[PDB]
Amino acid sequence: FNPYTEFPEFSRRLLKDLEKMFKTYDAGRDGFIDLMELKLMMEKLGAPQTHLGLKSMIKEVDEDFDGKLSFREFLLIFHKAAAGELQEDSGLLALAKFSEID
Ligand SMILES: [Ca+2]
Ligand SMILES: [Ca+2]
Ligand SMILES: [Zn+2]
């Protein structure tokens, strides 16, 4: 996985910022953000989600079908947001907008 060829529209600064955010919320430090971690991220960001809402969020970008978020799938969230691909009511969009990244 190469984030520079995969997401060429992301500056180096933005990549690091997102790496910083991913690491912040991977509380267990296993390299993934799972439903429990994502629950705590949405609470902290001011956009708390229901348990099925959080499952729906992950599902949207869970390209390896494992229930949790790899870094690349995390980045994919922000790609979609910046490309106009998230619905206006998506918790993923609340994630991107309330990250105060950018
Ligand atoms: Ca984790
Ligand atoms: Ca996954
Ligand atoms: Zn469940």
34 Cβ contact partners less than 8 Å away, ≥ 6 residues apart: 28, 67, 68, 69
Contact 22, 74 (CB under 8 A): yes
Q: Which ligand is the nearest neighbour of the Cα of 23? A: 1
Return the number of other C-beta atoms located less than 10 Å from residue 12's C-beta.
9
Q: What is the distance in A from the centroid of ligand 3 to the CA of 59?
A: 12
Only one residue has tokens 């902290």, namely 44
Cα distances (Å, whole numbers) of residue 80 to 30, 36, 39, 49, 76: 25, 23, 20, 19, 6
Can you read off the two tokens belonging to residue 65?
């079908």
State the CB neighbour count (10 A cutoff) for residue 37.
19
Q: Quick one: which of 77, 10, 80 has its CA closest to 45?
A: 77
Q: Resolution (in Å) of the shown entry?
A: 2.8
Could you tell me which of 49, 41, 78 has the C-alpha nearest to residue 61?
78
Measured between alpha carbons, how far is 39 from 21 in angstroms, rounded to an integer?
14
Rounded distance, CA 75 to CA 21, Å? 10
Ligand whose nearest atom lies closest to the CA of 72: 2
Q: Cα separations (Å) of 43 from 4, 39, 54, 65?
A: 30, 6, 11, 24
**CA angle in degrees (0–180, nearest 5) for 17-22-26:** 150
Question: Is 62 annotated in some ligand binding site?
Answer: yes
C-alpha 11/C-alpha 89 separation (Å) is: 27
Q: Which residues of 26-35 are buried (b: 16+ CB within 10 A; e: fewer)?
A: beeeeebbbe
Pairing of strands 69-70, 32-33: antiparallel
Whether 102 has a binding-site annotation, put simply, is no
* Ligand of minimum distance to the alpha carbon of 66: 2
